[PDB]
Structure formats: structure tokens, C-alpha cells
DNA sequence: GCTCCCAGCTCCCTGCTGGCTCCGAGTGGGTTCCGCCGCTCTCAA
DNA sequence: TTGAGAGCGGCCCGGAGCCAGCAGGGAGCTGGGAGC
């Protein structure tokens, strides 16, 4: 069978090079210099080079001595491993969206209305504009009064407004965007985004209890962790055997009087000692701040390093002198 | 031949039986070139939409089915030279499948992709 | 590489880019290596 | 005619020659240099 | 409506170990035939 040779092509133009070379093969197959190669493979996820099915590097060279996209690989070619033919052809696989182009790139937008034409969809965005003040941009609420005062390209229709290149806003930019220019799958906006418009996290060394099954009321230390079904190896008390448990069956239960850390939330980054562990509510006194904090068992975590006492930004630490006003 | 060779990259969609990849223009002007006698691809559009799949992964510019281990794998060593899709996502209507079975042409799905 | 091994699993791009990563870490160790060309910045000064 | 000292063989192993890294004396002061290309939308004509 | 600009977004010998290639004894291995 013919062997595969890897030839480098311009990044992002492998499909165009393949189309051009097959067109040239069509044009020159009946001539005195036909292309002796058999086929060409341009995998969708492979960029930078393509594969040519030929018996000889001479045939590969005579085939690729066409468009200049393959000039860099024209000097030399590289065999594809014999076991690699099988891998060559393998292929592996009121909402919210995000724009692809423009200054609104990677920004959450709320799908307000969906046009049946399947051409554009109405989206609600937060304007990343300076209101024609600096240009002759962080997200901020639309200021119709501010843009009207600044003048320029602006049309006032009460709550509705058109400005700076047919950009429409109402009360919040309300503009139509292309179907292919946005991603409708895998956005998952956060609670802050919801306001503007499950998860399993187990780590080694933590103690989790079994809240169901014949192995209930058993607390084991976390040794391994998986995606959904952990099949954990718990170090249960008075049980040397390592059982198996999923993430759902286990709960982040902590013994009375131990240091705990807030993984996330308004209390994130804080440490303290629990006061009373209820069924869901765990009340703790933070160490550096003698503050009572109520958190879920999922939100707690154990570490040997206490709170630094510095702001997240590293500019001010706790118990410091600041300027409320001059 | 050039008739089977697509002319542009717009509106590409592959057939469900022979995985023939061609545009709506030549599907309208001629339909399929492999099982046109068995399918009556020519002269309509509603049934063409059902009998053709717009989602195909990978294509092969096969021209020599008799001596191609590609053609061996994808079971087109018996079809003509042309452009065929490695994977085709879709299925024929039960009525058309039954008609083909009665005529003696069992419908073999071309969806060779690994679904998870 | 992490993304490619997670999903693509090309095993050819994977190997090539692994070799490039090894080259980059070797460059971090020493820019000077007899067996391979030296790294450089847009200003053209060989890295330190 | 089969061991056995011997001969030949046959690996066997210690004993000779070539490409190769890597260094290379003590302070002022001056001049130069730090992307480039692609790319998509705003305003002007 | 289209063309370009402005700004975002992405890409000259030293020495000396040192390996590797080759070359010559050298005892094991088994024939060889000398001896009984």
C-alpha cells in the first residue's frame, strides 16, 4: 500500500492547498506529467501540515511542486509511522452566548429574541464603550443621558437609542448578531452574569462521610479523586480496607473542632474553627477575624496554612490605616 | 468525472447511501450519480433533503476503488470514482428504507464515526 | 499539549510539540547548546 | 573410533587513534535598541 | 455603501577526557587423526 508523507503547508490554508492541488491534478492528469500520488489527507484538527498518500518521496515532491504553500516542506518530507494510518483518519468529538469578533469578544450576552430566519438573533450586551469621549473598554451600564449630552452619532427614542454605527440599546445594548458569530453551547454564565442580565471538587487529605448505602455513617480520608464517579479509596475508621464510593454518595463532613478553609463564595479565602455542624449549615469562627460564618459542607476545605491576612490584591492587609477621606 | 466534481464550497451535503458529496446545484440538475435509478433523487427537493445529510466529517477524493484500501474500509470499492464522505450523520425515512429493502437494496448506514 | 492529549490524541502533533517543549525547557536551562539553534527575541538578542 | 593434545576457529577483550567541549587579566563614557502583520470596523467623500 | 485608519487581538587555539572503531592474544569448542 502507498505510504503517507507529512508535508508542511501554510497554517490555516491546508484546505485551500488541498483544493488547489486536486484542481491542478484534474487539469494535468491527461498531460505528460500526471500526479502519481493517490490521495491527500487534511485532518480538521491538524494545522501546519498535511499527509500525501504516495509510494515515493519523489512522487510527493513532484506533486507538491505546485503552489508555494508547500515550499517549506518541499526541501524534505517525513514518513508517517506504519501504525499511524489508523490514527490518521480518526475523528474525536433565552440562553446566553458570547461574541467572536469586535470589541465585545468573549463577553456574555443574553439571547433576547431568536429570529426564525436563522440569520441573526437579538442579543442583550453590556456596552464596552467610552461614549465617544476618548476615541476620536471595561463593561459598564449604558448611559443614554451621557451619550445624548456628548452628542455625536446618537438618536434618542426615549429608552431606545441608536449610536456609533447602528448600535441599538434599550433601557443594555439590544442588537442583532449573526448565528455563526456567537457560541450557543458551553457558556454557562455565573451568578454575577445572571444578576447583570452541579460540580464535584474533592481533594486528597480531606475527610468525607458516607450518607447513604449499607456503608453509611463511615468517615474516610480522601485519597483519590475522579470526574463524576470517584470510586474513592476511603480510610474509614476501624477499617483498613479501601472501599469504593462516588462523589455523590460522599459528603464533606468534618470532625468537631478542626481548621477549615472556604474554597469559594463571599467567605472565600477565610479560615477558622467550626462551632456547630448542623445537617447543612456549618457555623465557624474565623481565626483572624472573630466572625461567625455559616457555610455548606461543600464550601469547606482543610489546609495547614492559615490566612495570610492580606487583601486579595496585595495592597492592604487587615487591621491597617486607610484614608476614608482627606 | 467533472460532473461529479463539485464546483464550489457552498451548500455541501453528502448522500446517505453512497456518501456522495456534491452541491444542491448538481443534485437539482442531475441528483445522485450512483443510485439515482434506485432513489429518484432528480426532480424534487423535499425528498432530497431527507435523502441527503448536511453533516459529514471528512472527505476522500477516491478515483481507483478497485485498488484502494480506503475504498476497502468504506465499502465503496464497488462504486464509481468520485468524492465520498468518511462519516455521514443521518438516516433515511422508514418508508424509503422499506422500499429499498423490497427492491433488494439493503440500506447500510454510512455513519462510521465513533459516538463516544 | 494538555488539551491535545485530552481530546485530539493525535500522537503525531503530540510528539512533535512534545519535542518542541523539551527544546524550550532545554533553552531555559542553557541558551547555549551545540546540537541545536539558539533562541531569540523580537529584538534579536539571544536569551539569557 | 574416542579421548585428547592440537589446529583452526571464534568470539573476546584489552589495547591504540579521531571529533569535541571551553575557557581566555583591572574602571569612564558614548551610542543604540527594545514587532510586525493581520484585521475589522468609523468616519469621510 | 465603501475605503482606509485606529486599535484590539494573535504569533584563535591550547588540553583532556571520551567515545567509538579496529587490531592482536587467547582459551573454549569441536574436529582431526595420532595412539591404543
Q: What would you say this structure looks like, in words?
A:
The structure is cut from a larger assembly and holds chains A (326 residues), B (116 residues) and C (48 residues). Chain A is α+β, with helices and mostly antiparallel strands and 326 residues long. Helix content of chain A is 13%, strand content 25%. Chain A has six helices and 19 strands. In chain A, strands 18-17-16-15-19 form a five-stranded antiparallel beta sheet, with no helix packed on it. In chain A, strand 12 and strand 13 form a beta hairpin. Chain A is flat and about 90 Å long. With 116 residues, chain B is an alpha+beta fold. Chain B has one domain: Herpes Virus-1, CATH 3.30.40.210. Chain B has five helices and five strands, in the order E-E-H-H-H-E-E-H-E-H. Chain B has a three-stranded antiparallel beta sheet with strand order 2-1-3. In chain B, strands 4-5 form a two-stranded antiparallel sheet. Chain B is globular and about 35 Å long. Chain B starts with 11 loop residues before the first strand and ends in a 13-residue tail after the last helix. Chain C is mainly α. Helix content of chain C is 50%, strand content 0%. At the A-B interface, helix 1 of A face strand 4 of B. Chain A binds a DNA duplex (45 and 36 nucleotides) through loops. It is classed as transcription. Keywords: intac-PEC, Transcription termination, Endonuclease, Phosphatase. The structure of INTAC-PEC complex. Chain A is Transcription elongation factor SPT5. The organism of A is Homo sapiens.
Q: Write down the Rg of chain B.
A: 13 Å
By helix and strand content of chain B, what is the structural category? Answer: alpha+beta
Radius of gyration of chain C: 13 Å
Order of helices and strands of chain C: HH
Put simply, the count of helices of chain B is 5
Q: How far is the N terminus from the C terminus of chain C?
A: 26 Å
Report the biggest beta sheet of chain B as strand number plus sense, adding barrel if it closes: 3 strands, antiparallel
Strand content of chain B: 15-25%
Region (Interaction with RNA polymerase II) (chain A): 131-202
Family (chain A): Belongs to the SPT5 family.
Region (Interaction with SUPT4H1) (chain A): 1-93
Protein name (chain A): Transcription elongation factor SPT5
Amino acid at each position: 500500500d502507498p505510504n503517507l508523507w507529512t508535508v508542511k503547508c501554510k497554517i490555516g490554508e491546508e484546505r485551500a492547498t488541498a483544493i488547489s492541488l486536486m484542481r491542478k491534478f484534474i487539469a494535468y492528469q491527461f498531460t505528460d506529467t500526471p500526479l502519481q500520488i493517490k490521495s491527500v489527507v487534511a485532518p480538521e484538527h491538524v494545522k501546519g501540515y498535511i499527509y500525501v498518500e504516495a509510494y515515493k518521496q519523489t512522487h510527493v515532491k513532484q506533486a507538491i511542486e505546485g503552489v508555494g504553500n508547500l515550499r517549506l516542506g518541499y526541501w524534505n518530507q517525513q514518513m508517517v509511522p506504519i501504525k499511524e494510518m489508523t490514527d490518521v483518519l480518526k475523528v474525536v468529538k433565552k440562553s446566553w452566548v458570547r461574541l467572536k469578533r469586535g470589541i465585545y469578544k468573549d463577553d456574555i450576552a443574553q439571547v433576547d429574541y431568536v429570529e426564525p430566519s436563522q440569520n441573526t438573533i437579538s442579543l442583550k450586551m453590556i456596552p464596552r464603550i467610552d461614549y465617544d469621549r476618548i476615541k476620536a473598554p471595561p463593561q459598564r451600564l449604558f448611559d443614554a443621558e451621557k451619550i445624548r449630552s456628548l452628542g455625536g452619532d446618537v438618536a434618542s427614542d426615549g429608552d431606545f437609542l441608536i449610536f456609533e454605527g447602528n448600535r441599538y440599546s434599550r433601557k443594555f445594548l439590544f442588537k442583532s448578531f449573526a448565528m455563526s458569530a456567537v457560541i450557543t453551547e458551553g457558556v454557562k454564565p455565573t451568578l454575577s452574569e445572571l444578576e447583570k442580565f452541579r460540580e464535584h471538587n474533592f481533594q486528597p487529605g480531606d475527610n468525607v462521610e458516607v450518607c447513604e448505602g449499607e456503608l453509611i455513617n463511615l468517615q474516610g480520608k480522601i485519597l483519590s479523586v475522579d470526574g463524576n464517579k470517584i470510586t474513592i479509596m476511603p480510610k474509614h475508621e476501624d477499617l483498613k480496607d479501601m472501599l469504593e464510593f462516588p462523589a455523590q454518595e460522599l459528603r464533606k463532613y468534618f470532625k468537631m473542632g478542626d481548621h477549615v478553609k472556604v474554597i469559594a463564595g463571599r467567605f472565600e479565602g477565610d479560615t477558622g474553627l467550626i462551632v456547630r455542624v448542623e445537617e447543612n449549615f456549618v457555623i465557624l469562627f474565623s481565626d483572624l477575624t472573630m466572625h461567625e460564618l455559616k457555610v455548606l459542607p461543600r464550601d469547606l476545605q482543610l489546609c495547614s496554612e492559615t490566612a495570610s491576612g492580606v487583601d486579595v490584591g496585595g495592597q492592604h492587609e487587615w487591621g491597617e490605616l486607610v484614608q476614608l477621606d482627606p | 468525472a467533472l460532473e461529479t466534481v463539485p464546483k464550489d464550497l457552498r451548500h455541501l451535503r453528502a448522500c446517505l447511501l453512497c456518501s456522495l458529496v456534491k452541491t444542491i446545484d448538481q443534485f437539482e440538475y442531475d441528483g445522485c450519480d450512483n443510485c439515482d435509478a434506485y432513489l429518484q433523487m432528480k426532480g424534487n427537493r423535499e425528498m432530497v433533503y431527507d435523502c441527503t445529510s448536511s453533516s459529514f466529517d471528512g472527505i476522500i477524493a477516491m478515483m481507483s476503488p478497485e485498488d484502494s484500501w480506503v475504498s476497502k474500509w468504506q465499502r465503496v470499492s464497488n462504486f464509481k470514482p468520485g468524492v465520498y464522505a468518511v462519516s455521514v450523520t443521518g438516516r433515511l425515512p422508514q418508508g424509503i428504507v422499506r422500499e429499498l429493502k423490497s427492491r433488494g437494496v439493503a440500506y447500510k448506514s454510512r455513519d462510521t464515526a465513533i459516538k463516544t | 499539549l494538555r488539551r491535545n492529549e485530552q481530546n485530539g490524541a493525535a500522537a503525531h502533533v503530540i510528539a512533535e510539540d512534545v519535542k518542541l517543549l523539551q527544546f524550550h525547557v532545554a533553552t531555559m536551562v542553557d541558551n547555549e547548546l551545540p546540537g541545536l539553534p539558539r533562541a531569540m527575541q523580537k529584538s534579536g538578542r539571544p536569551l539569557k
